[PDB]
Amino acid sequence: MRAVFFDLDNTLIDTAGASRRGMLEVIKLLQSKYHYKEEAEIICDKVQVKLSKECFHPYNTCITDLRTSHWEEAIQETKGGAANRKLAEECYFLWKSTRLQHMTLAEDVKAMLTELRKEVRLLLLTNGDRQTQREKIEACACQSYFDAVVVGGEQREEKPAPSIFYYCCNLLGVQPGDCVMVGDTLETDIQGGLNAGLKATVWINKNGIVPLKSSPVPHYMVSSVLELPALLQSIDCLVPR
Ligand SMILES: [Mg+2]
């Protein structure tokens, strides 16, 4: 038996592009409805930074309150005035709904996943807070293409902690040496698969970059997730074409 674990964000769905889309829409809102000028982009830039700086959480968080607060702060830090929670909410929920709407599985990614599952067990392994990730999973309707879906923020530890990989292995009833991890992030997906002693790691190198020394090195590298079947058909995973 063989299994393939897939990363989610930016591997199977365009998360970053979806987020950019969300900012584009907020900018439009602030500029058209509220007549903001370039403070629109300034505020959005601030939120992006705040988003990027969130780390902890699992002990307990209301992500909606936290991220609404990023907006509230960014508005006040840019335009001053009294804190405006209502406007913060208007921005947040526009950004959120816009991004979730943008997240979809391309038809060739759907076909690819369908083909893989005929021969191997498929699992989605995605870092991030429970609510946000489950919302993304619902938005791109991907749960039906996998035998299981595991979310880092629902677990005790996330990628690259080997524990979450061993959990995934048990969930599918396989061993780490039966498994392949596919993802676009060296420090989570690849390091994690290396930590957990998986059969192989596949790095989707979208940026066409040479890993700086001291970075994790994957077993295999592809520029697109659509290259996976041919690759897996060559290593000990899928039968030859
Ligand atoms: Mg990713």
93 Cβ neighbours under 8 A, 6+ residues apart: none
Cβ atoms 159, 152 nearer than 8 A: yes
**Pairing between β-strand 179-183 and β-strand 200-204 as defined by DSSP bridges:** parallel
Coil, strand, or helix at residue 211? coil
CATH 3.40.50.1000 fits 2-13+104-241, yes or no: yes
Q: Residue 159, annotated ligand binder?
A: yes
CA 183 to centroid of ligand 1, rounded, Å: 6
Q: Where are the domains of the chain?
A: 2-13+104-241, 14-102
Please give the Cα distance from 11 to 224 (Å, whole number): 9
- Residue type at 92 in one-letter notation: Y
DSSP-derived 3-state class of residue 149: strand
CA–centroid distance, residue 94 to ligand 1 (Å): 23
C-alpha 72/C-alpha 82 separation (Å) is 10
Question: Is residue 96 marked as binding?
Answer: no
Closest CA to 196 of 221, 176, 222: 176
Distance 139 CA to ligand 1 centre (A): 17
Cα–Cα distance between 189 and 216 in angstroms, integer? 10
What three-state secondary structure class fits 151?
A: strand
CA distance 139 to 103: 7
DSSP string, 51-118: HHH----TT---HHHHHHHHHHHHHHHHH-SS--HHHHHHHHHHHHHHHHHH----HHHHHHHHHHHT
Q: How far is CA 133 from CA 152, 184, 198, 209, 220, in A?
A: 9, 17, 24, 27, 27
Q: How many Å is the Cα radius of gyration of the chain?
A: 20
Resolution (A): 2.0
Instruction: State how far Cα 104 lies from the chain centre.
Output: 12
Q: In a 10 Å sphere around its CB, with 0-12 CB exposed, 13-18 middle and 19+ buried, how is residue 89 labelled?
A: middle
Separation of CA 89 and ligand 1 centre (Å):
27
> Does 8 count as an annotated binding residue?
yes
Which method was it determined by? X-ray
Task: Report CA-CA distances (Å) from 195 to 113, 154, 173, 178, 201.
Answer: 25, 20, 19, 15, 11
Distance (Å) from CA 125 to ligand 1 centroid: 10
Tell me the sheet residues that pair with 148: 123
Cα–Cα distance measured from residue 46 to residue 137, given in angstroms and rounded to the nearest whole number: 27
List the structure tokens of 193.
């698969």
Give 85 Cα–ligand 1 centroid separation in angstroms: 31
Is residue 126 part of an annotated ligand binding site? yes
Angstrom distances, CA of residue 38 to CA of 29, 51, 76, 79: 12, 20, 15, 11
**Quick one: which H or E segment has residue 124?**
strand 121-126
Distance from Cα 10 to the centre of ligand 1, integer Å: 5
Could you tell me the CATH superfamily of domain 14-102? Answer: Haloacid dehalogenase hydrolase-like domain (1.20.120.710)
Cα–Cα distance measured from residue 1 to residue 120, given in angstroms and rounded to the nearest whole number: 7
- In one-letter notation, the amino acid at residue 81 is G
> Measured between alpha carbons, how far is 153 from 157 in angstroms, rounded to an integer?
8
Task: Consult the annotation and say whether 184 binds a ligand.
Answer: yes
Chain position carrying tokens 């697109």? 224
Distance 69 CA to ligand 1 centre (A): 25
Cis? peptide before 160, omega within 30° of 0: yes
C-alpha 4 – ligand 1 centre gap (Å): 15
Report the side by side order of strands in the sheet with 148-151.
148-151, 121-126, 3-6, 179-183, 200-204, 220-222
Is there a binding annotation on residue 127? Answer: yes
Cβ-proximal residues to 31 (8 Å cutoff; 6+ apart), any chain: 37, 40
Q: For residues 148 and 84, what is the distance between their CA atoms, to the nearest angstrom?
A: 41
